[PDB]
């Protein structure tokens, strides 16, 4: 789980958290305005030391139409089942230690991505 910013309703600014001492609940107040709203996530901050980020979430379907990207026929797609497919490393800095590929289907209207 993570936590996202929730803007105010009137002034549209950052809402800081607040622990209601009276009703013993979690609130989000506004620095300028006096808006209040009852919380639901019961979380404020989370830190990922390992930074276990799913590279698949960053990959896009447009990578398929790349003329300087390798293609293989031995790793067909799952949904559509097309043969042609591309493969490449994380291509992201701060790679811990892994050259694990991220296969992406090479066909319109699919944009599927998987890993083996």
């Amino acid at each position: 789980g993570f936590v996202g910013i929730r803007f105010c309703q009137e002034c549209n600014n950052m809402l800081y958290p607040k622990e209601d001492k009276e009703n013993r609940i979690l609130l989000y107040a506004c620095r300028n305005c006096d808006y209040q709203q009852e919380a639901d996530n019961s979380c404020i901050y989370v830190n990922k030391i390992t930074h276990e980020v799913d590279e698949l979430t960053q990959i896009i379907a447009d990578v398929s139409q790349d003329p300087t990207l390798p293609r293989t026929e031995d790793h067909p797609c799952q949904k559509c089942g097309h043969k042609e497919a591309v493969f490449f490393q994380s291509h992201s800095a701060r790679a811990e230690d892994a050259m694990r590929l991220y296969y992406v289907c090479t066909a319109p209207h699919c944009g599927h991505r998987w890993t083996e």
Binding site: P67, T68, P70, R71, E73
Partner: protein, 60 residues
């Protein structure tokens, strides 16, 4: 194109004709990073182990 160019000097045929015809193209150092360049036209395209088979350009 080769025949029309070999008879240059005599008539009026020059490099501008090749550029306009759509055979050559000026790629700068910043764009050269997003094109599958090829060394020779014949050797690197015939039919072998599938390397890329998606060459976009080719050096002279």
């Amino acid at each position: 194109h080769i025949d029309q160019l070999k008879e240059r000097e005599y008539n009026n045929y020059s490099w501008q004709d090749l550029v306009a015809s759509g055979v050559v193209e000026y790629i700068d150092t910043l764009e050269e990073e997003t094109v599958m360049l090829a060394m020779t036209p014949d050797d690197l395209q015939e039919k072998e182990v599938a390397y890329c088979s998606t060459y976009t350009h080719c050096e002279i």
